[PDB]
Design a protein around this ligand. Structure first.
Ligand SMILES: CCCCCCCCCCCCCCCCCC(=O)OC[C@H](CO[C@@H]1O[C@H](CO[C@H]2O[C@H](CO)[C@H](O)[C@H](O)[C@H]2O)[C@H](O)[C@H](O)[C@H]1O)OC(=O)CCCCCCCCCCCCCCCCC
Ligand SMILES: CCCCCCCCCCCCCCCCCC(=O)OC[C@H](CO[C@@H]1O[C@H](CO[C@H]2O[C@H](CO)[C@H](O)[C@H](O)[C@H]2O)[C@H](O)[C@H](O)[C@H]1O)OC(=O)CCCCCCCCCCCCCCCCC
Ligand code: CLA
Ligand code: CLA
Ligand code: CLA
Ligand code: CLA
Ligand code: CLA
Ligand SMILES: CC1=C(/C=C/C(C)=C/C=C/C(C)=C/C=C/C=C(C)/C=C/C=C(C)/C=C/C2=C(C)CCCC2(C)C)C(C)(C)CCC1
Ligand SMILES: CC1=C(/C=C/C(C)=C/C=C/C(C)=C/C=C/C=C(C)/C=C/C=C(C)/C=C/C2=C(C)CCCC2(C)C)C(C)(C)CCC1
Ligand SMILES: CC1=C(/C=C/C(C)=C/C=C/C(C)=C/C=C/C=C(C)/C=C/C=C(C)/C=C/C2=C(C)CCCC2(C)C)C(C)(C)CCC1
Ligand SMILES: CCCCCCCCCCCCO[C@@H]1O[C@H](CO)[C@@H](O[C@H]2O[C@H](CO)[C@@H](O)[C@H](O)[C@H]2O)[C@H](O)[C@H]1O
Ligand code: OEX
Ligand SMILES: [Cl-]
Ligand SMILES: [Cl-]
Ligand SMILES: [Fe+2]
Lengths: 35, 341, 37, 451, 35, 35, 35, 30, 333, 33, 33
């Protein structure tokens, strides 16, 4: 058993912020991907 | 105790102006960059490099003075005073644009010295070095715009000149030739800068309007003592206000201030990436589908196609005087014009 | 032009409009004279 | 020093005029001295404009904003706006300068020498901001004074020489108004007009009869309202609707002044009746219409058929139709087809611009006026280089319409900001939290959670 | 009391201020140059 | 169009009357501290 | 031997005003005046 | 095809707005 | 009484989103503007913006992406005339002449003004100091300048800013061509406002983050060291002041948190006020500085400056913008 | 319009791979207690 | 080969949407103890 294990967390606010970042980045770059 | 330790004690002494080890790099380089800019905008012409007047001595005002970039035939020469172009002659060095590379190189090393100063003072005072990390974004902007962009281009000539109207020329050049407004990295930079200004205004106003009454003065600035332990404003009231006005609100002060760090720094870094792309002429100039449609269909018009026509006008009308080394002779009949005007 | 008998006072007229601006500046001078108390 | 520091007054130096809120004598001194400043600027600026005035050159080419106001009143001008005597301008300037000396003496006396509070000296001149009867009485006095001023404008128009009329038959001239429009239908139909294009609300008043009749109505209404507020106390709904404090009254006046500044900006930009183009230059719409007229005249003299000439897009090069069918000038000046000017109305028939009067009835004075207004369009730089932003440095011209409109938009916007500042502060000070949140009795702590 | 004179602050102040006054004199002289 | 114009005029008049009479309905009293 | 600080501030600000006004005067006269 | 993509991303953003406003982590005052 | 219950509900601070009377105006106008904007941005037919029967397509279904799409401003033939739906003979005519733009911008401007009023209203209901709405007046003034004041000064809503990304860029470029906004001091003050706002935002954020008091261990996020509603300050203001005072000098650093946050509010708000006023004052054609042919040699030859290069770029934009709309030599509006 | 074909799948992956990643880290956070 | 272009994104979605679903459940099962 490795003692260097740690639990990972991501709260709901961080989920909302990350989803907003990803969706806005996709909305920005989609026109350039389609070109 | 050793000369190094005694010099360290002297450099880190408490003073009106902190010096530190980083001061040896910072103060000469920053002073020489500022002095070179003031000297160039006061006394030095751009007549042999651009064909322009750019100093107070020639009659330019504060908006129109600049230390202009060297001539395009210099290439990416460092243009040292003792180098093979000037050959130790200060007058010829000024006339050939050596002050531009002087300011650019001393400014780069001064920016390095200032970030090292941020690190050194953070280490001495005992705080985390997030101010230096935030200052990495102006350094990225300066390196991408003043160093990487002309290095990708043909010469130092297409770097920005150190002046107000010269920087405005640089903006209009990037619009006309690169379509830099269409670039998504510049769009992220604009979002970062405007969001930083918004966050600055909104956080300042929110703090000033959720203050606790801690005095009887109708001017509330005296109601704060720096050694006090309690918060000077109500985070709960501010959170409820913005939750009911805007829908969402900060509830964590540390996250709020990290976000204030994060937004403009990330914006500036994205814009620096876009400027690297433009250094290689890797532009977001056009959308291919729209151009195929517009080529085959003479009734299809968008604001993007109108912007492309504006860019054609900028390039054709600006290039003979903005790029005098090319010896562009555009006759009047080849200039793209609309009806009348 | 002004009426001719007033022509000798033409320079003074030339500096009359800027006097209200000085009034604003005068306030700050007065405050500096009392230490901005 | 009474109330002259932060410890006794609660206000810092940068809010030091807020120390005057409850000091009626010193506040009166501040007001009278400031009124002296206003009158001083009027007189000194008039003398400055007169000292550099070249009477044969048009007023709008000389950076004048006060001489056109005197000239519109009919003082010192003849037919066509020609200056015939500069002495009324001098009289207006010097009388304002001397009166400003008197007002400055009074303001200084009440500010530093007179009694700090007027309540002990006089029940009539003393006041308390919370006394609504006294506030309405002072408002009534000032309403009567404003009504008398409006009637003074009427008296100038009807008895003491008249006003300059740009619509007078045979060019603009000084005209005595003998039949002002007293019909409430016309006056309050101006009040009820749309503010949008083609209607223009009160900015669209286009004859001096309506102007004089409106000022008769304004003077009578202001005098009646002044007597009403002298004789009556505020009602219960008014007492419950407003904050009754000095800062609150200031904020109400700030909102009113912001709205009036926006209206004055639109008035000087669009109206060529109370701002005649002989004195203020052409309006922007006027200059665009003048350019279209100028090139219609030039090409018709070259033999073109201006009615059948077709532009690049298929619209008429010189003449087209407005969306409601009127024959109007072509090009971008299609946006300015609601423009009315005395040099253009002789060519207008029932269906808009008339082709036959265009072909046969364009006089040389109209061609001169069109060329002059085309080349003095209200376009110029901040350093007063006339023309579009791409023009070279040879013409030193910015239209006074541009200066007046821009300056008063800036002032009107900042006074809207001041209204917001003082209205919010008056509300917070009346409720008692303008200094911040009480730590012990924070309201949000007594509220339920949102979620 | 017993304050010194020539400190680091003195050097910084004068390295900024001496050329500033020199340059201001130069530009003031430039205002009187004709073509 | 005429029916639409009357409908929009009625809706706008209703909301504006709500605004005006709401701010006449003792708004300075509706604050947490005083009255 | 103390000159009041308000006198020093007033004189320095007047000097700044004179220098700036000289620069604007030179904007209208001599080199850079387009004349 | 590209229009559907843009409208889909925009609608996902609006749905995210709804959930971030009405189904947020409640700020629990300690 | 039904009216008393309705007044209690409207002004209730227990609603998840506060309404208020300003919100009674704000919600329908902003809902109308939002719904019409989404529908027009997706599916509006092309609009003859310049009034020269040259329709410009701005919706996604007519060949645009997110970047190039816009709600196109109303026709130049309309000008400043009020153009509601019932003024048009049909919806096809209303869509052809850019009626959706007028609907959206009028509803949006009213709703945003009521948003400012609503910010005041909620601050009053919560016992707050009232001036957040004053800070919001700067972007609101900017919106009024680009959507209302500039069309009024220029005489047509066709010259308002298009509701799109590339339309915004078109507005910027044509504005620089016609007014030389870069050389206008109010726009320079606005750039100082936004650059300084970003700078001071990054500065304040990094200085507060730098001086956070240790409350957590190395594994967890430092943000868990702050609890919502806690009474103690989560960072050392004195340590941040000591750092920043050694970074420049002691008297360039705020030791007062209230003065610092007032400065953070005041710098970008005043800068944006000035740039909005710049747009309005250039709407009445008081343009930026003109230094074309300012520098002249002894003989009389024009010596070019950087302002002359800017003038060349402006001339290119000027002769190419609205390439079919001009019949006469001067672009007077 | 003659758009790039891979621009669909790229955009989908640009949404899908990070979002579900965050979703994974969110849901396993919620199941911890 | 003239294949259906949508097939690619279809295949990707057919792989990705249910798989990450299982991954979500599995990961939130592992963090429950
Ligand atoms: C962040 C960290 C903190 C900031 C630190 C800042 C410190 C300051 C560093 C300054 C670096 C100056 C480098 C100048 C340079 O590069 O100068 C450029 C020269 C190359 O010279 C160029 O070479 C070109 C190509 O020439 C060749 O091709 C020609 C055509 O055939 C001819 O034949 C010619 O003879 C032949 O040599 C052209 O001639 C150019 O005019 C000429 O300038 O390289 C060289 O010195 C060396 C090149 C090695 C790589 C270094 C560049 C780093 C970034 C590159 C990004 C590119 C995009
Ligand atoms: C936060 C910051 C917020 C700040 C934003 C403030 C904005 C307010 C601006 C307008 C206020 C005054 C309205 C006004 O005087 O409104 C009237 C003006 C005047 O409008 C113009 O009025 C003209 C009147 O002139 C006519 O009559 C004249 C008579 O001499 C001349 O003959 C002239 O040539 C002739 O055309 C024409 O009718 C024009 O078509 C018409 O557009 O309108 C305009 O500028 C206004 C256009 C509509 C505005 C409606 C919104 C306000 C609620
Ligand atoms: C510490 C501060 C500092 C720093 C980092 C720089 C940095 C720079 N200066 Mg600069 N400068 C400074 C202070 C500083 N300066 C001061 C105080 C002055 C006023 C006198 C100047 C005046 C000045 C001028 C006038 C010019 C520069 C230039 C330059 C650039 C090129 C220099 C070069 O190639 O030589 C690099 C030299 C070294 C790195 C020295 C190496 C020493 C090590 C220890 C090796 C040991 C050598 C050995 C003992 C001797 C060998 C003997 C024999 C074999 C040769 C560079 C960016 C040039 C420029 O900007 O071009 C556009 C230029 O023209 N400087
Ligand atoms: C239109 C501008 C204006 C006016 C009319 C006033 C008027 C006033 N201010 Mg004030 N103020 C202003 C702008 C103005 N302020 C500005 C811009 C600031 C910010 C710097 C302040 C900051 C400020 C503070 C901090 C305070 C005042 C106070 C006062 C009042 C008493 C002043 C006093 O004791 O004088 C003392 C000053 C002197 C004796 C110096 C001489 C002043 C005279 C009037 C100069 C006149 C010059 C003129 C050429 C003379 C013509 C005479 C001729 C006509 C015969 C007074 C009513 C005070 C107050 O509220 O008192 C309770 C107070 O504490 N003000
Ligand atoms: C009739 C108009 C009017 C009146 C009577 C007042 C009266 C008052 N205001 Mg107010 N205000 C107004 C308009 C008005 N305001 C407008 C239009 C705005 C919007 C900008 C404000 C914004 C405002 C704020 C933000 C505050 C006040 C405050 C106050 C109080 C103290 C003011 C003081 O001491 O200033 C002292 C004067 C100065 C410090 C000078 C300021 C210098 C100005 C800003 C620059 C002017 C530049 C000039 C026009 C052009 C350049 C000149 C050149 C020489 C450089 C006082 C009751 C204070 C308050 O609430 O107290 C209760 C306060 O904090 N006002
Ligand atoms: C807004 C203007 C205003 C107001 C309300 C006051 C109010 C007051 N002043 Mg004051 N004063 C003013 C302006 C004003 N003054 C000016 C401009 C000056 C300089 C001339 C003075 C000089 C002055 C002195 C020297 C004294 C006062 C005194 C007084 C107090 C008693 C006056 C009295 O009993 O009535 C007297 C009423 C009259 C004499 C009737 C005058 C009627 C005038 C001449 C008609 C003018 C026509 C029209 C109304 C104004 C036209 C100008 C307009 C376009 C601006 C009272 C508080 C006294 C005081 O405080 O004692 C302790 C005192 O000794 N005042
Ligand atoms: C400087 C001018 C001025 C000022 C500040 C006041 C101030 C006041 N008057 Mg008043 N009044 C005046 C001139 C003035 N009066 C004049 C000249 C007259 C004669 C006609 C009157 C006749 C008068 C009467 C008969 C009454 C008042 C009343 C009042 C009080 C309550 C005001 C109120 O709630 O109305 C605010 C306005 C409203 C409630 C109207 C509803 C708002 C609508 C929707 C605004 C629409 C306009 C919009 C902005 C568009 C503009 C263009 C439009 C014309 C189409 C207040 C003390 C009342 C009172 O208590 O007196 C004892 C009262 O009953 N006044
Ligand atoms: C390059 C070079 C060098 C260097 C030099 C130097 C270092 C110099 C310096 C110089 C300087 C150091 C100068 C200065 C200048 C300054 C000036 C010229 C100033 C001006 C100012 C003004 C004009 C002001 C303004 C203002 C503002 C900003 C705002 C408010 C208002 C006022 C007005 C106050 C050497 C030899 C080493 C080497 C070789 C090369
Ligand atoms: C309270 C106060 C204040 C204010 C004040 C004021 C604002 C005042 C005003 C004042 C004024 C408002 C004054 C006035 C004066 C005037 C005069 C004294 C005049 C005279 C005149 C004359 C002498 C004339 C002459 C002539 C003629 C006859 C004609 C020809 C030309 C000539 C010009 C030569 C301040 C802010 C400082 C602050 C503190 C306190
Ligand atoms: C001279 C003239 C004329 C005439 C005029 C007139 C006759 C006028 C009048 C006018 C008027 C008769 C006006 C009125 C106005 C009003 C106003 C401006 C109002 C305001 C209001 C307010 C401000 C309210 C507020 C409120 C609300 C919202 C609710 C609750 C609370 C309170 C109470 C706060 C004409 C144009 C023919 C022509 C030219 C000349
Ligand atoms: C276009 C609109 C403009 C024209 C119409 C307005 C002209 C001005 C006339 C004043 C009318 C104000 O009348 C106002 O009405 C409301 C509704 O009954 C009254 O009644 C209100 O009182 C209290 C607050 O005090 C509330 O809790 C109560 O529910 C409510 O009924 C107000 O006390 C009264 O002041
Ligand atoms: O519409 Mn939009 O932009 Ca104002 O200038 Mn004239 O018009 Mn058109 O040209 Mn240039
Ligand atoms: Cl265009
Ligand atoms: Cl045209
Ligand atoms: Fe903060």
């Amino acid at each position: 058993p490795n003692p260097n294990r740690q639990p990972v967390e991501l709260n709901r606010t961080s989920l909302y912020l990350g989803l907003l970042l990803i969706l806005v980045l996709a909305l920005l770059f989609s026109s350039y991907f389609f070109n | 105790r050793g000369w190094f330790d005694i010099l360290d004690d002297w450099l880190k002494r408490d003073r009106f102006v902190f010096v530190g080890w980083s001061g040896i790099l910072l103060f000469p380089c920053a002073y020489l960059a500022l002095g070179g800019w003031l000297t160039g905008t006061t006394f030095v012409t751009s007549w042999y490099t651009h064909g322009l007047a750019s100093s107070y001595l020639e009659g330019c005002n504060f908006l129109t003075v600049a230390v202009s970039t060297p001539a395009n035939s210099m290439g990416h020469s460092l243009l040292l005073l003792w180098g093979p172009e000037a050959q130790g002659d200060f007058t010829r060095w000024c006339q050939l644009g050596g002050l531009w590379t002087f300011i650019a190189l001393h400014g780069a090393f001064g920016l390095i010295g200032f970030m090292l100063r941020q690190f050194e003072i953070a280490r001495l005072v005992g705080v985390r070095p997030y101010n230096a990390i935030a200052f990495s974004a102006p350094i990225a902007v300066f390196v991408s715009v003043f160093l990487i962009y002309p290095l990708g281009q043909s010469s130092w000539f297409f770097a920005p000149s150190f002046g107000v109207a010269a920087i405005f020329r640089f903006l209009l050049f990037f619009q006309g030739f690169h379509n830099w407004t269409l670039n998504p990295f510049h769009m992220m930079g604009v979002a970062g800068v405007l969001g930083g200004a918004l966050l600055c205004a909104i956080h300042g106003a929110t703090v000033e309007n959720t203050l606790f009454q801690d005095g009887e003065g109708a001017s509330t600035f005296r109601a704060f003592n720096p050694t006090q332990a309690e918060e000077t404003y109500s985070m709960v009231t501010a959170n409820r206000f913005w939750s009911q006005i805007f829908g969402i609100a900060f509830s964590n002060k540390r996250w709020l201030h990290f976000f204030m760090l994060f937004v403009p720094v990330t914006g500036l870094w994205m814009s620096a990436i876009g400027v690297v792309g433009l250094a290689l002429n890797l532009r977001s100039y056009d959308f291919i589908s729209q151009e195929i449609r517009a080529a085959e269909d003479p009734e299809f018009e968008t604001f993007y196609t109108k912007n492309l026509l504006l860019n054609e006008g900028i390039r054709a009308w600006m290039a003979p005087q903005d790029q005098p080394h090319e010896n562009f002779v555009f006759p009047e009949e080849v200039l793209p014009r609309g009806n009348a005007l | 032009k002004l009426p001719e008998a007033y022509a000798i006072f033409d320079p003074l007229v030339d500096v009359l409009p800027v006097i209200p601006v000085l009034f604003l500046a005068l306030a700050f001078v007065w405050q500096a004279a009392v230490g901005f108390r | 020093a009474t109330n002259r520091d932060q410890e006794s007054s609660g206000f810092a130096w940068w809010a030091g005029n807020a120390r005057l809120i409850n000091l009626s004598g010193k506040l009166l001194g501040a007001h009278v001295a400031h009124a002296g400043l206003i009158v001083f600027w009027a007189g000194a600026m008039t003398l400055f404009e007169l000292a550099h005035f070249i009477p044969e050159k048009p007023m709008y080419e000389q950076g004048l904003i006060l001489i056109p106001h005197i000239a519109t009143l009919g003082w010192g001008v003849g037919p066509g706006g020609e200056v015939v005597d500069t002495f009324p301008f001098f009289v207006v300037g010097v009388v304002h300068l001397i009166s400003s000396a008197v007002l400055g003496f009074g303001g200084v006396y009440h500010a530093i020498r007179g009694p700090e509070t007027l309540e002990e000296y006089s029940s009539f001149f003393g006041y308390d901001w919370k006394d609504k009867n006294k506030m309405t009485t002072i408002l009534g006095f000032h309403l009567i004074v404003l009504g008398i001023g409006a009637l003074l404008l009427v008296a100038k128009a009807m008895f003491f020489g008249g006003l300059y009329d740009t619509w007078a038959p045979g060019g603009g001239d000084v005209r005595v108004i003998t039949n002002p429009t007293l019909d409430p239908r016309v006056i309050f139909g101006y009040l009820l007009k749309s503010p949008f294009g083609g209607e223009g609300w009160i900015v669209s008043v286009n004859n001096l009869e309506d102007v004089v009749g409106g000022h008769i109505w304004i003077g009578l209404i202001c005098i009646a309202g002044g007597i009403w507020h002298i004789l009556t106390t505020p009602f219960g709904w008014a007492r419950r609707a407003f904050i009754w404090s000095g800062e609150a009254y200031l904020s109400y006046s700030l909102g009113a002044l912001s709205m009036m500044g926006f209206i004055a900006t639109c008035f000087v930009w669009f109206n060529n009746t109370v701002y005649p183009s002989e004195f203020y230059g052409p309006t922007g719409p006027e200059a665009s219409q003048a350019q279209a007229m100028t090139f219609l005249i030039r090409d018709q003299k070259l033999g073109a058929n201006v009615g059948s000439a077709q532009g690049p897009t298929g619209l008429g090069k010189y003449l087209m139709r407005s969306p409601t069918g009127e024959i109007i000038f072509g090009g971008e000046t299609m946006r300015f087809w609601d423009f009315r000017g005395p040099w253009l109305e002789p060519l207008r028939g029932p269906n808009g611009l008339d082709l036959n009067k265009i072909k046969n009835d364009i006089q040389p004075w109209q061609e001169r006026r069109a060329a002059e207004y085309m080349t003095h369009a209200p376009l110029g730089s901040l350093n007063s280089v006339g023309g579009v932003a791409t023009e070279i440095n040879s013409v030193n011209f910015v239209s006074p319409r541009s200066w007046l409109a821009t300056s008063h938009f800036v002032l009107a916007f900042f006074f809207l900001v001041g209204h917001l500042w003082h209205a919010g502060r008056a509300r917070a000070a009346a409720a008692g939290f303008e200094k911040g949140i009480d730590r012990e009795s924070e309201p949000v702590l007594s509220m339920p959670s949102l979620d | 009391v017993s304050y010194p004179i020539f400190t680091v602050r003195w050097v910084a102040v004068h390295t900024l201020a001496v050329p500033t006054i020199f340059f201001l004199g130069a530009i003031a002289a430039m205002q009187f140059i004709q073509r | 169009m005429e029916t639409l114009k009357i409908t929009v005029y009625i809706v706008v008049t209703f909301f504006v009357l709500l605004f005006v009479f709401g701010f006449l309905s003792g708004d300075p009293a509706r604050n947490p501290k005083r009255k | 031997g103390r000159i009041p600080l308000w006198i020093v501030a007033t004189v320095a600000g007047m000097g700044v005003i004179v220098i700036v006004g000289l620069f604007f005067y030179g904007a209208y006269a001599g080199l850079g005046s387009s004349l | 095809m590209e229009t559907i993509t843009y409208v889909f991303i925009f609608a996902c953003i609006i749905a995210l707005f709804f959930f971030a406003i009405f189904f947020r982590e409640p700020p629990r005052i300690t | 009484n039904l009216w008393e219950r309705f007044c209690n509900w409207v002004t209730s601070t227990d609603n998840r989103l506060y309404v208020g009377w300003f919100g009674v105006i704000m919600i329908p106008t902003l809902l109308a503007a939002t719904i019409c904007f989404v529908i027009a941005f997706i599916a509006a037919p092309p609009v003859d913006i310049d009034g020269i029967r040259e329709p410009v397509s701005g919706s996604l279904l007519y060949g645009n992406n997110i970047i190039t799409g816009a709600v196109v401003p109303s026709s130049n033939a309309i000008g400043l005339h009020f153009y509601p739906i019932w003024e048009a003979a049909s919806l096809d005519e209303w869509l052809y002449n850019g009626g959706p733009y007028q609907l959206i911008i009028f509803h949006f401007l009213l709703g945003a003004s009521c948003y400012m009023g609503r910010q005041w209203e909620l601050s009053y209901r919560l016992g707050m100091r009232p001036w957040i709405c004053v800070a919001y007046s700067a972007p609101l003034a900017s919106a009024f300048a680009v959507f209302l004041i500039y069309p009024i000064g220029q005489g047509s809503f066709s010259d308002g800013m298009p509701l799109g990304i590339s339309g915004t860029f078109n507005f910027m470029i044509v504005f620089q061509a016609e007014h030389n906004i870069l050389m206008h001091p109010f726009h320079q003050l606005g750039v100082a406002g936004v650059f300084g706002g970003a700078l001071f935002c990054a500065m304040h954020g990094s200085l507060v983050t730098s001086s956070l008091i240790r409350e957590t261990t190395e594994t967890e996020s430092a943000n868990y060291g702050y609890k919502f509603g806690q009474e103690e300050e989560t960072y050392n203001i004195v340590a941040a002041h000591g750092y920043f005072g050694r970074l420049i000098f002691q008297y360039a650093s705020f030791n007062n948190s209230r003065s610092l946050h007032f400065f953070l509010a005041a710098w970008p708000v005043v800068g944006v006020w000035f740039t909005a006023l710049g747009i309005s004052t250039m709407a009445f054609n008081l343009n930026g500085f003109n230094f074309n042919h300012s520098v002249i040699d002894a003989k009389g030859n024009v010596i070019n400056t950087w302002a002359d290069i800017i003038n060349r770029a402006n001339l290119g934009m000027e002769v190419m913008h609205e390439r079919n709309a001009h019949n006469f030599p001067l672009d007077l509006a | 319009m003659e758009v790039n074909q891979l621009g669909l799948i790229a955009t989908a992956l640009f949404v899908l791979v990070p979002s579900v990643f965050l979703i994974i880290l969110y849901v396993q956070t919620e199941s911890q207690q």
